[PDB]
A paper describes a structure:
[name] is a non-canonical ATP-dependent histone chaperone and a major cancer target. From a structural standpoint, [name] exhibits a conserved multidomain architecture comprising an N-terminal acidic domain, two [name]+ ATPase domains, a bromodomain, C-terminal domain, and an exceptionally long C-terminal linker (CTL) that bridges the bromo- and C-terminal domain. Unlike most other histone chaperones that do not require ATP for activity, [name] stands out due to the presence of an ATP-dependent [name]+ ATPase domain. The [name]+ domain adopts a conserved structural fold found in the [name]+ ATPase superfamily, with each monomer consisting of a large α/β nucleotide binding domain (NBD) and a small α -helical bundle domain (HBD).
Numbering used by the authors:
A (entry chain B): 422 to 729, 786 to 946, 1330 to 1389
B (entry chain C): 421 to 727, 786 to 945, 1330 to 1390
The structure:
């Protein structure tokens, strides 16, 4: 029994939808003033779990509380199929007759994509017949009354082109994944009636830590946490096999319960394809934070839409270049992509183009470019262009070059790429796409002495000098930081692991100085060049 | 239920040629028997979706139903005759025909006939073949059905059994194309007739040219969304209440900004699944290339006279220019958009390969055949100097052979753009253009006047907003310094200029951004 209250972050859509069916049943004077006859059709589409069905259910539950009373008809995917020849096209006719009898009413076709495909001469005739009769019913010789048709779909492009037209489906609503803000309202709604209400700061600090959670993940995590407290409180519940009596007044939920559930589950989005966004690990942050900030500020210079009448830009493009082993295409670009949320990102790389065996790669590229254009602004991600170029046939190169050229000049679509060879060493065809004079090239340099000092600061001496459950180590830190003053990233974290290995080697030694000499031997025995 | 040959607009030839079939034999019956004519009694409407077909049927039925001469009317859906029992699938058609004959004259209407009579084939069931057979043998066989007229409608004409399409069964076919400039104005006149504050005709005429690619139901939906937007602008407090309020029906007038918002929010029905290869100049870039567009149009008028009947012989043209001059991205789409009422067929890399499950040769043959069917038309091949190298010899031979078989005097234009000069283009391309005839156009950079007109609007008026001699100095310096830049450099400079105006929005005092504009002027250097 939800009535326009469990929804979160969707204000414009509900306003349009209540303009959609409620106004003619409430204010039948403005419409007759100019003979408007407002529209009677909608179409929902988007990634799963965004609240596609909850909106319809809330509408049906709310509007049934008349006056004015509103009926409802719900249908599954392909209920209108039978073995004989003359029933499938008759179920729709009798359904329309019944709905017209009790007008006004609402007819909701659930997942029309499995009912009305694109017309073709290759498949069976039954699909053509049913799509034809459905097409005739919506707008025939006689006009239908006060019926409203609603449809949902996961693949918008698979619908017959003759259905999308003023008269049948004249409005298309895009349901996207929730942004940073809406998660707060979702958490508030799902955790409303709790006696120990969590503070708004608690909810917000949970909010920035959940990226890629889509509607149902939030509901799942709220229920996967209240069970951790139950399991912790009364461990001896599984042993028995009979009814027990409990004490439900001291099982209040704590903050520490949320962390375990968060580490245990994964979002629905990052379940079938890896998401091309990862925040820096807690170990690498005090080594690359400043560089990442510099990259984003340069992007802000070149991409005005990254601020936080409209800004105007002209073909935003950026490229990151640096020596191999600098971690540019492995740690920097994912962090940059993750920092810029609320922007849909599409991946174009070797694993994806050849990762499907049913379609040509150029078809995939055209589809990706079209989808990027449709929902601008967006970021097109393509890593390691210096190897990416000399792998595909000339046809794909020409198609990619032309498709990008046809985008409107002021359309804010970003092109992000990374390379290992220097700019002058790249092939020319790449070269006349980056205009460094304009400020489209960013170079990478190794971190300074203070950053490297902070990198090893925590290990020595806080973890090594940690009691099992102090001056020579300064010289060890000095010699380590002076020795590693010309190391790339990979060598830097490689050296970090080997020391932690001998750190973990000595769990139960309460007497020190039995491994400090081992430490100073290991740091000098190790040699990389 | 109150439409009678008046709510229809823009269709005159079809309605004129239609009433001569179901009215003339009854109104003037003393002429046909002199020549024993038995005039044709078959029609089949077809066209792109949303062009207003069923409205014609509704108007005809409503007009003929009420009048001095009474004629019956029967209606059918797509495949509403099929029944589970074997003996009832085809018997319903016989009963319907008998009833129609018993009450002659009468009218039989099939809606979406393509869902009832597919082409006969051996790779499907038998009931469809049986229905097709009895239909084609029952309409005109050994009995001379007499005065019965059959009308069908569909969107896919090529999916009809050819045995049904020959005189005797389906006599005439009518083409329902998208409305042009004048028809859109007429349908606007039709759809806004009963408004108390009657809009001026000069407003509708101006608005008509803005709605390119629209057709029928799109116009009808716009005319309603406009009123909804007006109600939105007038009483924005209506959505935060679950109770009826008190409304005053005196301040609900319509303004132009409402139509602007509605047009911005909406997109046409035709180019929804794909994109048409035609776009007009944006307002920002417009005051730079109208002279070039007009010169190009004059060149076409010299070569293509369709812009006594005019005569032409294989019209061709080729726009060439240096890279960065903006000929393959700003000029050709403008020409295509300006020359409307000619159906377009694009042909380039993203279309030849972008769709799989077919061969390029099939696509190119189909495009040319279709363009020949709907002559006159336009064939567009952009970026020829690269398009000529990413195709195999087979496609080259097929294309070079196809355009030689078309009739010589048919008006089939071929349009293409090039970047390298015509001298450097390879062989077999230089012989397709006969520039001695005047088949080659050369572009050149815009001069000082339009350059100044481009920047004066931004740097004189927009630069000084309520929320001054040095402005002339900045304008003249900017114009002087950029007298050798191409289109891309000009738009980049425009954007980098506008960035400062954006970023200094909330400062009430000027002279803080004029300096910033200066350093932007000297610090910004192009590559050239
Ligand atoms: N704003 C929201 N508030 C509460 N629950 C939401 C919200 N958005 C999505 N949901 C969750 O999604 C469900 C309703 O939509 P649901 O996710 O079942 O449809 P969908 O998966 O998007 O569409 P389909 O299942 O057809 O692909 C509810 O069970 C609810 O937990
Ligand atoms: N020239 C016109 N004059 C008036 N109304 C028009 C015109 N063209 C289109 N329309 C409007 O557009 C609608 C088109 O409906 P109709 O079913 O007749 O077209 P259709 O192409 O047969 O539809 P579909 O393709 O969906 O079967 C009509 O209801 C009509 O009001």
């Amino acid at each position: 029994s939800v009535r326009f209250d469990s929804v979160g972050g969707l204000s414009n859509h509900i306003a349009a939808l209540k303009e959609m069916v409620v106004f003619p049943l409430l204010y039948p004077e403005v419409f007759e003033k100019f003979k408007i006859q407002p529209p009677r059709g909608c179409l929902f589409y988007g990634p799963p779990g965004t609240g596609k069905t909850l909106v319809a259910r809330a509408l049906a539950n709310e509007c049934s509380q008349g006056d004015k009373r509103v009926a409802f008809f719900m249908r599954k995917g392909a209920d209108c199929l039978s073995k004989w020849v003359g029933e499938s096209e008759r179920q729709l006719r009798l359904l329309f007759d019944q709905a017209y009898q009790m007008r006004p009413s609402i007819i909701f076709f659930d997942q029309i994509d499995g009912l009305a495909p694109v017309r073709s001469s290759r498949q069976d005739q039954i699909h053509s017949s049913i799509v034809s009769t459905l097409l005739a019913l919506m707008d025939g010789l006689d006009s239908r009354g006060e019926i409203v048709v609603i449809g949902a779909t996961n693949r918008l492009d698979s619908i017959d082109p003759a259905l999308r037209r003023p008269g049948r489906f004249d409005r298309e609503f895009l349901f996207s994944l929730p942004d940073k803000e809406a998660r707060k309202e979702i958490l508030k709604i799902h955790t409303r009636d709790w006696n120990p209400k969590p503070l708004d700061t608690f909810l917000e600090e949970l909010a920035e830590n959940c990226v890629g959670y889509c509607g149902a993940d939030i509901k799942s995590i709220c229920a996967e946490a209240a069970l951790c407290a139950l399991r912790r409180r009364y461990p001896q519940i599984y042993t028995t096999s009979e009814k027990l009596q409990l004490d439900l007044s001291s099982i209040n939920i704590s903050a520490k319960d949320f962390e375990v559930a968060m580490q245990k589950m994964i979002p629905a989005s990052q379940r079938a394809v890896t998401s091309p966004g990862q925040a820096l690990s807690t170990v690498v942050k005090p080594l690359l934070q400043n560089t990442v900030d510099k990259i984003l500020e340069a992007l802000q210079r070149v991409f005005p839409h990254a601020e936080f009448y409209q800004p105007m830009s002209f073909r935003p493009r950026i490229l990151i270049v640096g020596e191999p082993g600098f971690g540019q295409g492995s740690h920097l670009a994912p962090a940059v992509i993750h920092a810029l949320e609320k922007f849909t990102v599409y991946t174009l790389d070797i694993p994806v183009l050849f990762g499907v065996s049913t379609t040509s790669p150029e078809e995939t590229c055209a589809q990706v470019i079209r989808e990027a254009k449709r929902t601008a602004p967006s970021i097109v991600y393509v890593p390691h262009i210096h190897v990416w170029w000399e792998i595909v046939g000339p046809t794909l190169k020409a198609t990619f070059t032309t498709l990008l050229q046809n985008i409107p000049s002021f359309a804010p679509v970003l092109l992000l790429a990374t390379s290992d060879k220097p700019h002058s060493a790249l092939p020319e065809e790449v070269q006349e796409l980056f205009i460094r004079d304009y400020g489209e090239i960013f170079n990478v340099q190794l971190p300074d002495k203070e950053e490297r000092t902070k990198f090893f600061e925590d290990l020595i001496l806080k973890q090594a000098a940690k009691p099992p459950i102090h001056e020579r180590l300064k010289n060890l830190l000095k010699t380590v930081v002076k020795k590693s003053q010309n190391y790339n990233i990979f060598q830097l974290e490689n050296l970090y692991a080997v020391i932690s290995q001998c750190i973990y080697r000595h769990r139960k030694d309460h007497d020190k100085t039995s491994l400090i000499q081992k430490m100073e031997q290991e740091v000098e025995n190790f040699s990389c060049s």
